[PDB]
Design an enzyme around this catalytic site. Structure first.
Site, PDB file in Angstrom:
ATOM      1  N   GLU A   1      45.834  28.830  44.375  1.00  0.00           N
ATOM      2  CA  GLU A   1      44.626  29.239  45.071  1.00  0.00           C
ATOM      3  C   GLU A   1      43.502  28.225  44.977  1.00  0.00           C
ATOM      4  O   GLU A   1      42.888  27.902  45.997  1.00  0.00           O
ATOM      5  CB  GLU A   1      44.109  30.577  44.500  1.00  0.00           C
ATOM      6  CG  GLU A   1      42.806  30.991  45.171  1.00  0.00           C
ATOM      7  CD  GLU A   1      42.185  32.269  44.682  1.00  0.00           C
ATOM      8  OE1 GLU A   1      42.782  32.903  43.794  1.00  0.00           O
ATOM      9  OE2 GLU A   1      41.085  32.610  45.184  1.00  0.00           O
TER      10      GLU A   1
ATOM     11  N   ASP B   1      48.762  35.746  46.291  1.00  0.00           N
ATOM     12  CA  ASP B   1      48.465  37.127  45.893  1.00  0.00           C
ATOM     13  C   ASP B   1      49.717  37.970  45.794  1.00  0.00           C
ATOM     14  O   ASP B   1      49.768  38.931  45.004  1.00  0.00           O
ATOM     15  CB  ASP B   1      47.539  37.783  46.933  1.00  0.00           C
ATOM     16  CG  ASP B   1      46.161  37.203  46.848  1.00  0.00           C
ATOM     17  OD1 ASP B   1      45.704  36.976  45.705  1.00  0.00           O
ATOM     18  OD2 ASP B   1      45.486  37.069  47.919  1.00  0.00           O
TER      19      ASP B   1
ATOM     20  N   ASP C   1      48.262  32.177  41.250  1.00  0.00           N
ATOM     21  CA  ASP C   1      46.911  32.727  41.302  1.00  0.00           C
ATOM     22  C   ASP C   1      46.436  32.759  39.853  1.00  0.00           C
ATOM     23  O   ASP C   1      46.983  33.532  39.052  1.00  0.00           O
ATOM     24  CB  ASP C   1      46.866  34.112  41.919  1.00  0.00           C
ATOM     25  CG  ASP C   1      45.465  34.547  42.263  1.00  0.00           C
ATOM     26  OD1 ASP C   1      44.514  34.040  41.631  1.00  0.00           O
ATOM     27  OD2 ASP C   1      45.334  35.432  43.111  1.00  0.00           O
TER      28      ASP C   1
ATOM     29  N   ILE D   1      43.625  33.680  38.424  1.00  0.00           N
ATOM     30  CA  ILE D   1      42.958  34.947  38.158  1.00  0.00           C
ATOM     31  C   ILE D   1      42.988  35.726  39.451  1.00  0.00           C
ATOM     32  O   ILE D   1      42.235  35.396  40.363  1.00  0.00           O
ATOM     33  CB  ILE D   1      41.507  34.796  37.655  1.00  0.00           C
ATOM     34  CG1 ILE D   1      41.448  33.904  36.395  1.00  0.00           C
ATOM     35  CG2 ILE D   1      40.877  36.161  37.394  1.00  0.00           C
ATOM     36  CD1 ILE D   1      40.017  33.740  35.813  1.00  0.00           C
ATOM     37  N   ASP D   2      43.846  36.754  39.517  1.00  0.00           N
ATOM     38  CA  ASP D   2      43.867  37.670  40.644  1.00  0.00           C
ATOM     39  C   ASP D   2      42.987  38.829  40.245  1.00  0.00           C
ATOM     40  O   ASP D   2      43.224  39.457  39.214  1.00  0.00           O
ATOM     41  CB  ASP D   2      45.278  38.128  40.972  1.00  0.00           C
ATOM     42  CG  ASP D   2      45.315  38.914  42.269  1.00  0.00           C
ATOM     43  OD1 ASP D   2      44.716  38.460  43.254  1.00  0.00           O
ATOM     44  OD2 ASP D   2      45.922  39.993  42.287  1.00  0.00           O
TER      45      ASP D   2
HETATM   46  C1  LIG Z   1      40.387  37.976  46.385  1.00  0.00           C
HETATM   47  C2  LIG Z   1      41.543  37.280  45.640  1.00  0.00           C
HETATM   48  O1  LIG Z   1      42.742  38.065  45.376  1.00  0.00           O
HETATM   49  C3  LIG Z   1      42.853  39.406  45.789  1.00  0.00           C
HETATM   50  C4  LIG Z   1      43.563  39.736  46.936  1.00  0.00           C
HETATM   51  C5  LIG Z   1      43.663  41.062  47.322  1.00  0.00           C
HETATM   52  C6  LIG Z   1      43.044  42.051  46.572  1.00  0.00           C
HETATM   53  O2  LIG Z   1      43.183  43.380  46.888  1.00  0.00           O
HETATM   54  C7  LIG Z   1      42.317  41.711  45.442  1.00  0.00           C
HETATM   55  C8  LIG Z   1      42.228  40.389  45.044  1.00  0.00           C
HETATM   56  P1  LIG Z   1      41.052  36.740  43.951  1.00  0.00           P
HETATM   57  O3  LIG Z   1      40.017  35.658  44.084  1.00  0.00           O
HETATM   58  O4  LIG Z   1      42.322  36.180  43.317  1.00  0.00           O
HETATM   59  O5  LIG Z   1      40.542  37.981  43.221  1.00  0.00           O
HETATM   60  P2  LIG Z   1      42.204  35.865  46.610  1.00  0.00           P
HETATM   61  O6  LIG Z   1      43.276  35.253  45.773  1.00  0.00           O
HETATM   62  O7  LIG Z   1      42.838  36.484  47.887  1.00  0.00           O
HETATM   63  O8  LIG Z   1      41.032  34.999  46.977  1.00  0.00           O
HETATM   64 MN   LIG Z   2      42.478  34.333  42.270  1.00  0.00          MN
HETATM   65 MN   LIG Z   3      44.233  36.690  44.340  1.00  0.00          MN
HETATM   66 MN   LIG Z   4      39.658  34.087  45.466  1.00  0.00          MN
END
Ligand SMILES: CC(Oc1ccc(O)cc1)(P(=O)(O)O)P(=O)(O)O
Ligand SMILES: [Mn+2]
Ligand SMILES: [Mn+2]
Ligand SMILES: [Mn+2]
Ligand SMILES: CC(Oc1ccc(O)cc1)(P(=O)(O)O)P(=O)(O)O
Ligand SMILES: [Mn+2]
Ligand SMILES: [Mn+2]
Ligand SMILES: [Mn+2]
Ligand SMILES: [Mn+2]
Lengths: 275, 275
Positions: free
Chosen positions: A68, A218, A88, A90-91
């Site tokens: 990510e 994700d 990822d 930190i998800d």
């Molecule tokens: C929003 C992120 O991840 C998710 C995706 C889907 C969700 O329901 C919650 C968190 P995160 O930053 O990892 O927290 P993303 O990797 O898509 O930027």
């Molecule tokens: Mn993340």
């Molecule tokens: Mn994520």
């Molecule tokens: Mn993110």
């Protein structure tokens, strides 16, 4: 299972990363923004991802990566046949900066563009979810099995509202939720991380998860945990699941999954494998 | 302290009830309906409530009770000045039926219509939340403190969709969520139990909770845990919290609580002290 050594290494790295995330979640937060005031990140995400990629590079220098925060730094999210680690760090970044106790490290490992193993460490809970193709899904020594429910009117779903605040998009997300809720379903839950939501389906504690707007990192770790627990993955159209399509249904079975797909009106989204 | 002995006994009973719930969530269940197909109960709720009330009656025979499943069996939800035990044997019955891992035993104790202590045991997590008026709030012996956040645009809320499936009601619940979501807030979470949602605010892991449709036994144990952690309880009108009104805002502070109240359209509901 020729990828057993790789997965066992992935589990040790996920636990190490999880310890870094646990320590950081108790300390002061310097919240940073990415694309919007609700797309958050901290230095911890970047530190953990760099640790993971450098540790994997040392042991497996020929392997590829999709991370990510590396994609935020300009790396491409193109999946080749080469063994690839989809990370990822930190998800649940929004949860993390609030100390909401559902935060995960997610690692998916693909060969020939197909996931061979997945590791999801819910690090405040101390729950290590794992699965290897053909070998089952586990959480801390307990083999996982999806629920048996085939009646949507007796189902518990998981979903999230998303990172968009565009009025038309929010209206469509809430309309989809309304339509499912009023079938009726027993309820809808939201713990704030795609990977943990999917792992809850793998355990049987929820019957299905859906979301539009996720990214490949994700879902790459948790998808195989759902399928090795006896579940199914598909697109919100009912068509085949695609890691780069931004859309997923992760369900206990095809009956609930197809019933959910019939209520979801799709929102337009940029694929992760295209500019 | 004339009520510390009652509190110490309440904690013992809540843990005993919690062990019963923990064991029952892994076993076969008899899932029953109350007012609709999405208003659920099991035999465990009924068993736990009868155990709690009989145990309290033996030690404190002059005290009164308001218990969820006893009200379902015809008892009145009238709060007098007499010392009263306000009990929810299982908060999160839908979660319990699904094995979704957030279920709690809740006990609030009122004297002169004011809550003096609260106990909320999140069974599956093994987290015992407690608070005595003027003595602070604790989780497993560790002192709690609400978050400091005063900017609604950097807040994380908790809420739930509710037990109604009436189209006009669901539309209003989702409209309220949309208005808050698009302020914006960072996010909205739903773990499926009023008492646990409120304890998450008491810990600081969420900044505020709101809901219309709760009952007195949903909020009597956890409200005092939020306020002893430094938070506030308010009606959704911005006015004083009313235990029998079916409505609550439980927040880290009055700034966020009043801001939330400004977006909420009130849903009409029968009070717990109405027939
Ligand atoms: C929003 C992120 O991840 C998710 C995706 C889907 C969700 O329901 C919650 C968190 P995160 O930053 O990892 O927290 P993303 O990797 O898509 O930027
Ligand atoms: Mn993340
Ligand atoms: Mn994520
Ligand atoms: Mn993110
Ligand atoms: C729905 C019940 O409690 C709640 C109340 C509000 C919620 O958000 C979740 C659960 P439950 O049966 O205790 O699970 P209630 O006591 O109101 O019938
Ligand atoms: Mn109930
Ligand atoms: Mn209950
Ligand atoms: Mn309840
Ligand atoms: Mn500020």
């Amino acid at each position: 299972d020729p990828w057993q050594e790789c997965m066992d290494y992935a589990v040790t790295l996920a636990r190490q990363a999880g310890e870094v995330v646990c320590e950081a979640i108790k300390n002061e937060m310097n919240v940073m923004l990415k694309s919007s005031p609700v797309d958050l990140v901290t230095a911890t995400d970047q530190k953990v991802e760099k640790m993971l990629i450098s540790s994997i590079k040392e042991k497996y220098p020929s392997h590829s990566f999709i991370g990510e925060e590396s994609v935020a730094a300009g790396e491409k999210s193109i999946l080749t046949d080469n063994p690839t680690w989809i990370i990822d760090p930190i998800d649940g970044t929004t949860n993390f900066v609030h100390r909401f106790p559902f935060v995960a490290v997610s690692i998916g490992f693909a060969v020939n563009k197909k996931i061979e193993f997945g590791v999801v460490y819910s690090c405040v809970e101390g729950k290590m979810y794992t699965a290897r193709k053909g070998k089952g899904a586990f959480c801390n020594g307990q083999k996982l099995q999806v629920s048996q429910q085939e009646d949507i009117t007796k189902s518990l779903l998981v979903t999230e509202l998303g990172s968009s605040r565009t009025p038309e998009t929010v209206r469509m997300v809430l309309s989809n939720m309304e339509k499912l809720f009023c079938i009726p379903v027993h309820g809808i839950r939201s713990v704030g991380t795609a990977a943990v939501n999917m792992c809850l389906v793998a355990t049987g504690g929820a019957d299905a998860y859906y979301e539009m707007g996720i990214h490949c990192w994700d879902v790459a770790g948790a998808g195989i945990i759902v399928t090795e627990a006896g579940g199914v993955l598909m697109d919100v159209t009912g068509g085949p699941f695609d890691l780069m399509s931004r859309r997923v249904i992760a369900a206990n079975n095809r009956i609930l999954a197809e019933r959910i797909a019939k209520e979801i009106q799709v929102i337009p989204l940029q694929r992760d494998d295209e500019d």
